[PDB]
Nucleic acid binder design. Structure first.
Lengths: 116, 64, 144, 199
RNA sequence: ACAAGAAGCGAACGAGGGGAAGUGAAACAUCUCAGUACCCUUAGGAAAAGACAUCAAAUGAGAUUCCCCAAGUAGCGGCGAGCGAACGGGGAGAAGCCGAUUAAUGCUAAUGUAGAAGAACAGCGUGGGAAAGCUGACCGUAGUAGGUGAUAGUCCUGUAUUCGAAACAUUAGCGUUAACAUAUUAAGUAGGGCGGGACACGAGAAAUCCUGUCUGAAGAUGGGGGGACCAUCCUCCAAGGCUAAAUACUCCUGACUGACCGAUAGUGAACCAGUACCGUGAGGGAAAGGCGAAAAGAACCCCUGUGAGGGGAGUGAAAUAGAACCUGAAACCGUGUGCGUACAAGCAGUAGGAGCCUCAAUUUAUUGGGGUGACUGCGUACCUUUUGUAUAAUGGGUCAGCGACUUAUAUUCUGUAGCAAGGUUAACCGUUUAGGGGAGCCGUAGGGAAACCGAGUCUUAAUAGGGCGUCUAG
């Protein structure tokens, strides 16, 4: 029962090369270079999937810091004010209010400013 | 046909018992004047092969 | 059976054999469970029954003892519970042979107290232990 | 137990041979061992010693800059020997006598349970004619079946020797695969008694 | 000086004359490898052996050979590594003789080497083509064969079945002829010393067989053997020659088969292969299959050098099926389109992300899919080997194909199945996966070196003590 591996090898190698499309040079053409580029891409994606949550919080905090400083206090005093006023609004929503509706954020800072 | 070979020299020193193997003790062939008579008395007779060592005896003597 | 399709081995009967060196996911890739560079990792490796790496092996630190007896290999011990295979009432050496209780080359036999007889027997030329003798005659047997 | 033949006569068969149980694990092993006994296992391949030539070292060990080689018939090389080349081997297994007997008891009992056994008083053909037996199977409502009789006739053999899914066997040459492969089994009453005694 | 033979070549198997070393012993010399490889001589369809100067020690058996057990037992062994019986039991085959020889010839019978006959299907639709679809028939002692323009029991060759031989081998039976052979009971023999060899047995307490050397009987009122040796008993008569079968094998011939390969496989060799090629030589040793159903293999015209190559035309179902011809992957190399890219430093991706381009809806830039990726963050390949590798440590130019835990037996444990204090047969026979075959093996009892005793036994003066066992599942 001789088994020829050409057919299964072809679609196996093709599966890796299809996943390596858009890569430069040998990384999208030859399997030996493409297989470890696909693995490395998956490793970056797994780590960057944690770092994304880490990077957007930095973005929200900076946006909130700009908004609070435009009218009144800083971010460090803003978060303390929201915490003392029992305001649960997340930094994601706050940064969206600051960047897209400045009247509401002005009213939102006042509630934090009167609480300290 | 091809059978497993007994270690014919390990069969001359180990004997099958019910739950293990038995054997003589060493240090009893010669120079015996200097040994206390407790050694001459308690080195005389049978002991059991140790649990540690009876896997080797099973591999050496597969048919006993 | 129903059909040659729905004939199954009865789960637990069959187990998949182990194939060494077939990739990371199989659990036996790249070494076959052999470990790293060493004598036991090499192609013709073996454990060598009777070897401790150089110290005189256990079977050579201890002395040889005893001798083999030729009588012991022609004397068979017979149990009371094996006597149900005998045809008739006589229990002799030739009668134990045709019952396939003892080997055809056994010269003499001994009946020991292992099980219990169910019918009267007549023993002619076989030695009977003290415990077996009282069990024989308790069932109506005799020894001659 | 109590079965009825085609005409209507009452035939009683022992439960120990026709109503036992279905042991699928037992039946599978005996059936699959029969199929392994059909193999003849005649094949081979060349090892390093067997391939033509390849006795000399193709080049010196050191200096050339090539991977070291000891033979051109190495299993690594094209045209080289097979590492672990196949040889002829025996595929027949041992089925215990009681295991074979028990499997046939299980199969026959299961054949009755799914209405695949047909008892007939006798099945004889006057002439060695395929048409005569094809017509007799139609009235028996078994166009494709396995006929089991004692002393298979010398003209009943010829009648069934051409019909596609039809075979006529002696009770002493009935195998476990034949009882399962065919859609129906037409056993004569005389042949059913033989299985009653032999199982 | 006249007739008859021989010579040489060619597979394996046999018999015989010589006879290693690698290796293992974790070194190595005894030993192993192994009486193997190899060399040499020589035969037959087989060879050899073969009828007791054999075993056995039972109630005895009754030549040789081969198989399953006995048994990895008894033994041998730097008692190491290893080597390794026999008795006897179950089978196959059986046969015993004094020419069981060889070679011809003639009848008788049967094969073999060419052959012959050999059933039964139409219509319609699709299709290049019907064997496939639908409807309805027929043969079958012929229904799973190979083909035929796609898959056919009824188209062809075939198959089941029934049979032919002028001629010449072959096998067997009878008769005849001519070549050889036809012992008559066994002395340089048995035995012995010395040195070796073979026996499972390495000098060992070493029986038995062989013999280079030196010797050397008795001779049925006798002699050989029964594993040192002696006695008793049992058995058998060497020093004459034969003898079928069961057994070993394949250069081959036929029939048949394959959970064997399918062109890097399978023979080295599917092909003009032991070729080309390499070597003084012995010797080594490749690569290389496929148009199409049918060549219908492209008349003719055009460009070109009356070249290559192509474009038309034509053939074909198909011509990116056009002869480097089925399919036509990847590496690798071009052409076209869209987007990005010439102020920016690194494993080239990843997570975000503007812009642009392109399709589908949608009442019309709103989403969704696809391509691209300005800009930002993070981010030093893989394997191996290591305490530790981005490592300036190893390996890989790439792609495709191939490439490494097998097989046989023994044994142990686990699972599962059947039976279960029992389980199971092996070789064989068999009309052959059945059925028979119970020889044997394991389990059911252990203690002790052993005799021996036995749920006990051993040690001991001990009934004390202690060791090993005991109060089931195989």
């Amino acid at each position: 029962a001789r088994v020829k591996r050409g057919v299964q090898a072809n679609r196996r190698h093709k599966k890796i090369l299809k996943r390596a499309k858009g890569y430069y040079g040998a990384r999208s053409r030859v399997y030996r270079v493409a297989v470890q580029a696909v693995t490395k891409a998956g490793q970056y994606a797994y780590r960057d999937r944690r770092n994304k949550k880490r990077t957007f919080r930095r973005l929200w905090i900076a946006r909130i810091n700009a908004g609070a400083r435009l009218n009144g206090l800083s971010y460090s005093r803003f978060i303390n004010g929201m915490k003392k006023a029992n305001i649960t609004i997340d930094r994601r929503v706050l940064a969206d209010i600051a960047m897209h509706d400045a009247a509401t954020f002005g009213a939102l800072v006042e509630k934090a400013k009167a609480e300290l | 046909k091809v059978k497993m070979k007994t270690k014919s020299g390990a069969a001359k020193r180990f004997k099958r018992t019910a739950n293990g193997f038995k054997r003589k003790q060493a240090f009893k062939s010669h120079i015996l004047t200097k040994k206390s008579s407790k050694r001459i008395r308690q080195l005389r007779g049978l002991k059991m092969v140790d649990k540690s060592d009876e896997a080797a005896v099973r591999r050496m003597c597969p048919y006993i | 059976g129903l059909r040659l399709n729905e004939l199954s081995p009865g789960v637990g009967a069959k187990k998949t054999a182990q194939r060494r060196g077939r990739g990371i996911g199989s659990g036996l890739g790249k070494t076959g469970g052999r470990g790293v560079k060493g004598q036991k990792s090499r192609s013709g490796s073996s454990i060598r029954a009777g070897f401790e790496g150089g110290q005189t092996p256990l079977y050579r630190r201890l002395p040889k003892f005893g001798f083999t007896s030729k009588m012991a290999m022609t004397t068979a011990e017979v149990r009371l519970s094996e006597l149900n295979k005998v045809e008739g009432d006589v229990i002799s050496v030739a009668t134990l042979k045709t019952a396939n209780i003892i080997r055809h080359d056994m010269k003499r036999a001994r009946i020991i107290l292992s099980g219990d007889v169910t019918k009267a027997y007549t023993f002619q030329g076989v030695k009977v232990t003290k415990g077996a003798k009282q069990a024989i005659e308790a069932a109506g047997g005799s020894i001659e | 137990m109590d079965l009825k033949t085609v005409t209507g006569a009452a035939v009683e068969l022992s439960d120990t041979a026709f109503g036992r149980e279905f042991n699928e694990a037992l039946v599978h092993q005996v059936v699959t061992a029969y199929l392994a006994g059909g193999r003849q296992g005649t094949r081979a391949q060349k090892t390093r010693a067997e391939v033509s030539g390849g006795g000399i070292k193709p080049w010196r060990q050191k200096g050339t800059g090539r991977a070291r080689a000891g033979s051109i018939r190495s299993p690594i090389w094209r045209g080289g020997g097979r590492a672990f080349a196949a040889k002829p081997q025996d595929w027949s297994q041992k089925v215990n006598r009681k295991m074979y007997r028990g499997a046939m008891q299980c199969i026959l009992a299961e054949l009755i349970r799914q209405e695949r056994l047909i008892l007939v008083e006798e099945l004889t053909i006057s002439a060695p004619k395929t048409k005569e037996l094809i017509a007799k199977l139609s009235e028996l409502n078994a166009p494709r079946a396995l006929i089991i009789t004692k002393e298979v006739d010398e003209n009943l053999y010829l009648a069934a020797r051409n019909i596609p899914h039809v075979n006529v066997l002696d009770t002493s040459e009935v195998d476990p695969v034949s009882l399962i492969a065919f859609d129906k089994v037409i056993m004569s009453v005389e042949a059913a008694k033989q299985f009653e005694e032999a199982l």
